[PDB]
Write a protein that binds this ligand. Structure first.
Ligand SMILES: *C[C@@](*)(O)[C@H](CCCNC(N)=[NH2+])NC(=O)[C@H](Cc1ccccc1)NC(=O)[C@H](N)Cc1ccccc1
Ligand SMILES: *[C@@H]1O[C@H](CO)[C@@H](O)[C@H](O)[C@H]1O
Ligand SMILES: *[C@@H]1O[C@@H](C)[C@@H](O)[C@@H](O)[C@@H]1O
Ligand SMILES: C[As](C)(=O)[O-]
Ligand SMILES: [Ca+2]
Ligand SMILES: [Ca+2]
Ligand SMILES: [Ca+2]
Ligand SMILES: [Ca+2]
Ligand SMILES: [Ca+2]
Ligand SMILES: [Ca+2]
Ligand SMILES: [Ca+2]
Ligand SMILES: [Ca+2]
Ligand SMILES: [Ca+2]
Ligand SMILES: [Cl-]
Lengths: 142, 116, 254, 75
């Protein structure tokens, strides 16, 4: 930046662009050449897109040119880690984790059910055969 | 059946854009200068930690150094460059990640410029 | 079955062989002790309804072991909406005169619930299709039960990846394509009524029935299967229905 | 109902987002992704958004080739 008489001093990237914000011209006075100043300018002028702290739920932001990338904690996803993996327990999502039948319910958790010949186990998702020859199982391989 | 549309095919390894690299450090040893590129982390996870660009691409990834009337260039298949300079002259650097075996998106964008 | 392998004895336990007067007719799928699912077109030209037999536990048609169980077919129920000579609604429910005995070699295939089938089973890519049908479009039939793994397609893709033909039937919501269009593998004539079985988390379910195609394993075409999910409610209503008199019964649909 | 169009992959350092058009008027979307021989997996269930983060799926094997499709459901 420019104050009274400072421009009598030779240009300095540190003093003018790092310790202060510099205009394109101040940069050109340091680098001299056009292609070199232009190259410095791209990244310097780009700005830090991570300033809004776009990555939610404890995610980390990494600045890029005119964009950013969010690294999310294990239970989150989305461009900004806005999606909670645990809130996705519905039947269309890997059958709600049910071994056989899945039933969606609004207002409460989804439930698993089994085909005749099977009964739902204690874990609420697996099924076990109650009969000797349940359908869909190959005896000589069991 | 629902109305839908198919997306173009996508092979991550060959098509993901390489992010803007950053020069981590640089120091002098008389007439030689060692420039170090930061090993940028990727979204690829291995037992709960993120893999770096080098961890994923290994020998397929090389870095190009641009330093400064002409621009001089150096290449490395590690994260360090060791270049000959001149006693007393101040130099400026910029790196670019490159995967030479690629057909498209072979190079990342240039890193922010750093000077001595 | 064109381009398949022999299904090892016992590993295709729900496969049914239908015979008319000792002649190999079609395949079928055992869904419980007295009911078999098959294709409606298999019965278009049948006039002697008392010589209709279903064989279970079958593997090699050239020899008899103690695993086969024969039962006469008491009733054949087809949708009233089905028109002989056309492709739509190609499904049939057969009641056996006496239930079969479930054994290591005779086990029913699970009939799934409609939503589970449409929401989950429909997106498992590969399913098995089996039969003693023709080994080549022009060839002979198999002596040993053959089985093939085939990938399923959504109708939009099936239409886009198929060579267009001037007088081809529309693929309706009651059908689906599965197979390869490169002339390598497909179900074939004599395989109709056989199961298109889908594996999901340890259990096998019925998702299709071999129905029709435009030649066996012809380049640019896929095999077409009856989309069983559309008939689940109809099938269950009939399995708990008052058994009536004649062999053939055209039940209303839906 | 209208079919999504202009499906595009936006990926940098493996953070992979699928985007498409148009903005939904009385319709929601669901995305499916798979490898050429794998089962289809659903993501971004009934979203009103026109993007879907697939990063977690593709990083399972970065050398595989993936195909995705966007379903339009009336709502
Ligand atoms: C009865 C079954 O054995 C048999 C199975 C054929 C499976 N084919 C492939 N490629 N997987 N089905 C047939 O023989 C059908 C019977 C039929 C059904 C409806 C109308 C007419 C006949 N025949 C065929 O599939 C023939 N390719 C004839 C054909 C039918 C429909 C369109 C074009 C040709
Ligand atoms: C943070 O900043 C980026 C870039 O300006 C923007 O895209 C986000 O919406 C904001 O939260
Ligand atoms: C950046 O990375 C994310 C995923 C979290 O580990 C943060 O705490 C960290 O600063
Ligand atoms: C649509 As087709 C039965 O010709 O593959
Ligand atoms: Ca100043
Ligand atoms: Ca100044
Ligand atoms: Ca100045
Ligand atoms: Ca100052
Ligand atoms: Ca300073
Ligand atoms: Ca000036
Ligand atoms: Ca000035
Ligand atoms: Ca930036
Ligand atoms: Ca035999
Ligand atoms: Cl055919």
């Amino acid at each position: 930046a420019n104050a009274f008489l400072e421009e009598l001093r030779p240009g300095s990237l540190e003093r003018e662009c790092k310790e202060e914000q510099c205009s394109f011209e101040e940069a050109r006075e340091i680098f001299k050449d056009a292609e070199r100043t232009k190259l410095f300018w791209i990244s310097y002028s780009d700005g830090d897109q991570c300033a809004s702290s776009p990555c939610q739920n404890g995610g980390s932001c990494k600045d890029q040119l005119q964009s950013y990338i969010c690294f999310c904690l294990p239970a989150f996803e989305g461009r900004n880690c806005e999606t909670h993996k645990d809130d996705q327990l519905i039947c269309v999502n890997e059958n709600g984790g049910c071994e056989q039948y899945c039933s969606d319910h609004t207002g409460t958790k989804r439930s698993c059910r089994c085909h005749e010949g099977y009964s739902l186990l204690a874990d609420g998702v697996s099924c076990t055969p109650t009969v000797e020859y349940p359908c869909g199982k190959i005896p000589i391989l069991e | 059946e629902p109305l839908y549309e198919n997306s173009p095919e996508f092979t991550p390894y060959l098509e993901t854009n390489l992010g803007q690299p950053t020069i981590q450090s640089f120091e002098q040893v008389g007439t030689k200068v060692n420039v170090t590129v930061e090993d940028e982390r990727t979204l690829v996870r291995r037992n709960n930690t993120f893999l770096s660009l080098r961890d994923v691409f290994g020998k397929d990834l090389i870095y190009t150094l641009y330093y400064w009337s002409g621009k001089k260039t150096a290449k490395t298949n590690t994260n360090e460059f060791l270049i000959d300079v001149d006693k007393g002259e101040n130099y400026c650097f910029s790196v670019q990640a490159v995967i030479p075996s690629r057909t498209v998106n072979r190079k990342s964008t240039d890193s922010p410029v750093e000077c001595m | 079955i064109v381009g398949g392998k022999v299904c090892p004895k016992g590993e295709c336990p729900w496969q049914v062989l239908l015979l008319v007067n000792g002649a190999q007719l079609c395949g079928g799928t055992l869904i419980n002790t007295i009911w078999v699912v098959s294709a409606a077109h298999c019965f278009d030209k049948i006039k002697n309804w008392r010589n209709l037999i279903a064989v279970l536990g079958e593997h090699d048609l050239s020899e008899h072991d103690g695993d086969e169980q024969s039962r006469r077919v008491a009733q054949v129920i087809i949708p009233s909406t089905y028109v002989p000579g056309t492709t739509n609604h190609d499904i049939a429910l057969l009641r056996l005169h006496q239930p079969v005995v479930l054994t290591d070699h005779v086990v029913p295939l699970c009939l799934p619930e409609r939503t589970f089938s449409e929401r989950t089973l429909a997106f498992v890519r590969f399913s098995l299709v089996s039969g003693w049908g023709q080994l080549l479009d022009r060839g002979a039939t198999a002596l040993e039960l053959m089985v093939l793994n085939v990938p399923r397609l959504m109708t939009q893709d099936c239409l886009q990846q198929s060579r267009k033909v001037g007088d081809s039937p529309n693929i309706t919501e009651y059908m689906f394509c599965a197979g390869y269009s490169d002339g390598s593998k497909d179900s074939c004539k004599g395989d109709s009524g056989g199961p298109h079985a889908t594996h999901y988390r340890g259990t096998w379910y019925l998702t299709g029935i071999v129905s029709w195609g435009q030649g066996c394993a012809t380049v640019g075409h896929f095999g077409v299967y009856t989309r069983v999910s559309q008939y689940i409610e109809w099938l269950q209503k009939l399995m708990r229905s008052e058994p009536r008199p004649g062999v053939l019964l055209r039940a209303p649909f839906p | 109902t209208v079919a999504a169009y202009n499906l595009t992959w936006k990926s940098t350092n493996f953070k992979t987002i699928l985007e498409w058009e148009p903005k939904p008027v009385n319709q929601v979307y669901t995305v499916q992704i798979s490898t050429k021989s794998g089962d289809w997996k659903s993501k971004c269930f009934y979203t009103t958004d026109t993007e879907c983060d697939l990063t977690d799926e593709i990083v399972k094997d970065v050398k595989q080739t993936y195909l995705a499709r966007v379903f339009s459901y009336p709502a």
